[PDB]
A paper describes a structure:
In response to the N-formyl peptides from microbes and mitochondria, FPRs play crucial roles in host defense and inflammation. Although FPR1 and [name] share 69% sequence identity, these two receptors display distinct ligand-binding preferences. In contrast, [name] is promiscuous in ligand binding with recognition to a vast array of ligands with diverse sizes, structures and functions, ranging from small molecules and lipids to peptides and proteins, which enable its involvement in chronic inflammatory diseases such as AD, systemic amyloidosis, and atherosclerosis. In this work, we determined the cryo-electron microscopy (cryo-EM) structures of [name] bound to Gi and four peptide agonists with diverse sequences and lengths, including Aβ42, fHN, and two formyl peptides, N-formyl–MLFII (fM5, derivative of bacteria-derived formyl peptide) and N-formyl–MYFINILTL (fM9, mitochondria-derived formyl peptide).
Numbering used by the authors:
A (entry chain A): 6 to 56, 184 to 355
B (entry chain B): 7 to 340
C (entry chain R): 19 to 316
D (entry chain L): 1 to 10, 37 to 42
E (entry chain C): 12 to 62
The structure:
Amino acid sequence: SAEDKAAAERSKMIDKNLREDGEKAAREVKLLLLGAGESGKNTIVKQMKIIGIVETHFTFKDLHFKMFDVGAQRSERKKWIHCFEGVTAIIFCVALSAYDLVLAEDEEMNRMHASMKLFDSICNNKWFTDTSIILFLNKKDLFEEKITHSPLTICFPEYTGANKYDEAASYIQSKFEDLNKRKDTKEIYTHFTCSTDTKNVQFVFDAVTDVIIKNNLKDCGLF
Amino acid sequence: LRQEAEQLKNQIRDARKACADATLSQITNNIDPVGRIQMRTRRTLRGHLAKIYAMHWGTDSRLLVSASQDGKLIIWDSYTTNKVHAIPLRSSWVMTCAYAPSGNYVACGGLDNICSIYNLKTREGNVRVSRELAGHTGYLSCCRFLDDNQIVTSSGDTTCALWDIETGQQTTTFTGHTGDVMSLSLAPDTRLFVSGACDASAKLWDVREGMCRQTFTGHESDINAICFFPNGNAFATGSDDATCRLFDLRADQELMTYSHDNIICGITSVSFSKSGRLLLAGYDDFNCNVWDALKADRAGVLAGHDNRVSCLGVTDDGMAVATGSWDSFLKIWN
Amino acid sequence: SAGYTVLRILPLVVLGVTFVLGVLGNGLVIWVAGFRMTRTVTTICYLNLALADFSFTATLPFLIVSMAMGEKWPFGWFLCKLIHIVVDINLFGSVFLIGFIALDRCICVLHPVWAQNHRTVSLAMKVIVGPWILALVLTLPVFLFLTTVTIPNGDTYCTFNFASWGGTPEERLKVAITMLTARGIIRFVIGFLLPMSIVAICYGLIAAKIHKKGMIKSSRPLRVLTAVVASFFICWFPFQLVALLGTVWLKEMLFYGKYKIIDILVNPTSSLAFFNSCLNPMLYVFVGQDFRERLIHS
Amino acid sequence: DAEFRHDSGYGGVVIA
Amino acid sequence: ARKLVEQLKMEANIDRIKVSKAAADLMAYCEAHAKEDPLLTPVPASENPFR
């Protein structure tokens, strides 16, 4: 029958386009971003913008990246958090200077404590078991000036002391890796946002490259 | 004011007990159980490279559209296992897809906050987007075509809206849901539709009147699926509490429930057969549980999906049921 | 002697267990990857390796019954031809798939950007058809030169015969010497030196980069890599060394038979190489966690 | 790689 | 809370029939369309388009 065979070639040609476009989708890495309340998520996008939710595409060192921002989604995260499965890494943005601030929605809930609560959810959920987090700490320059004026003990009562930039950053960091229960399965790449260009994107490229090696080893069978 | 509303809610609850003279299961014990049905995968649609969220059956019972995260909207010819059209999408994050009753329009939506309608009857020969519905502040969870010109979309901002294709913006806005609306279902007469939200409550809406005629509160978890009975008298709700509830429009009360102790996972999709006697509900156990509507007894299992099933659809004549899961595979069961 | 008889029976049981475990492992790997798994470059290479191992193992009972009574072939000329061509093709296929898997892993580890951008399914097929072409080129001497001859005493052995090609006993013997030397050196270089140098270098750079980058959370990856390289070596190197020794001593063996140890040593080394071909999917495919999950789900 | 087969055109010594 | 109460008044002023009468209608439709349901009864292979 000619009619049945006429549509057979249409499916084959469509299949060729599907795999060709699907290879392009796998040609690029996907990165998910979390955090809000002026945590510096928008700043990260501008410096990495070499070229509804915000989607932009840029290429760094012959590697194609996908940028997703879900700050516009005011609905519950768990309804759509499973959509971002298979992303190479998650770029979490935390404002260092936000420790001595109070959320406008709730006065009892700290702004930075909510960031850790948001950070804890994206690591303990079953949809991101093997997805690494490229943790980003923003406003380190503003954090440095205010750490002398205001101390860290207000945010964390169980603080030893020595409220300097180096000691506080280590204690601020250490909370985030300890938040990650799955230490062996997934790794947290922590970096501080720098005003200099080509630096923050290099850390993302380096962290993604490490994840790509880890992902390839898992598929190969080494891990 | 607040006390009157609280007293009114108790008055409605008291009316439920008065109408609850006897449960459906006790009444329907006389009819013979349908029994065990052996359903096999007649066709397997293997053209997707990402998880599939929604699908819709056609009125001709041979063309179905499937939405996946790869960014391609594929219309499948289920009779011959062929792809009529592959529609690239601007945003690959789509949660729902719809197929017009005439078959000339297909709409999908998702995290992009835009419901895009594509014309399948283009004279040039390439499928292109016709209209882009904007105005939703939440993710598009479900959309259904009333006709070639009217479409109702369910958004993640606890609001459901009715849109006009030619006009370009929403005609009627339905509000009242506390949680994020997750599913939509249109009655056969198209006059009424129901929506399931995240507030563990599914309520009936009127297309013309534009407000909530009835509200049903029988679930205790996040409702993700809903579907009218083939006659439009009742509908079934699938939530994350591993139970399916049957609500009657003319009774405004939960008729009966579909609960099993062994399964504790939620329902992602649900529908009815041609007669409505057979209820099919997806689950997170990587398989579909098939229930008897009257007696809540399992009648079959549609296992065979490597990943979680997220969409399920029964064609208008009930010839076959197609289940799409996250393994980028669609199975035709009959 | 008593030890010699045991040394002769041991290859038979080794080949029997090779047949069994190869059939089971290759069948499971094919069933899971080919039909129950999404197509992937690593999955494609694993499927080709398993298919080669299964095709070699399917005809392996013929080798068992041939070695049972000393190289005698109870079957006809065409069937021996087909069995030998299949065995030869599948052996070079397994070796070249091992080498190409090593190369692919090295490319993915050393150059992750290139692997992400260029390693696709279509490219995987286009570069995987190559090793099979090389196997056909290296096997074509079996296509033409190998025949079946019958000893006047009644026994028959299907081996190389050059009555038609040489045309005279002297020319036939010269052609035999030349082709045997060429085949031995080609096997040693392309079949052994080329992949072993590739396998050692590819897995050597992988271990060097992983150790340098500090990705060693547990000893499992290093243990798996060491097991792969050590097994491939201790299995293929004995047989290849025996074949090379027989090739370089071709005139001594043919004219005077000075070195008789190779005659009794080929069979254990061949059995070890075939056991390696059997076990290749056991540590090349079964090690993957996703494959184990798919198998237990099936 | 290749099974070891040794013979001449006609005697040789081999092992399958 | 003005919007909430107004919608509740409309829902309150509806006709709610007994469950027994409502359940019979649901059961009657299933019986009257059982022969027309290809899922409830095994459809013949010749009539079934899916082999």
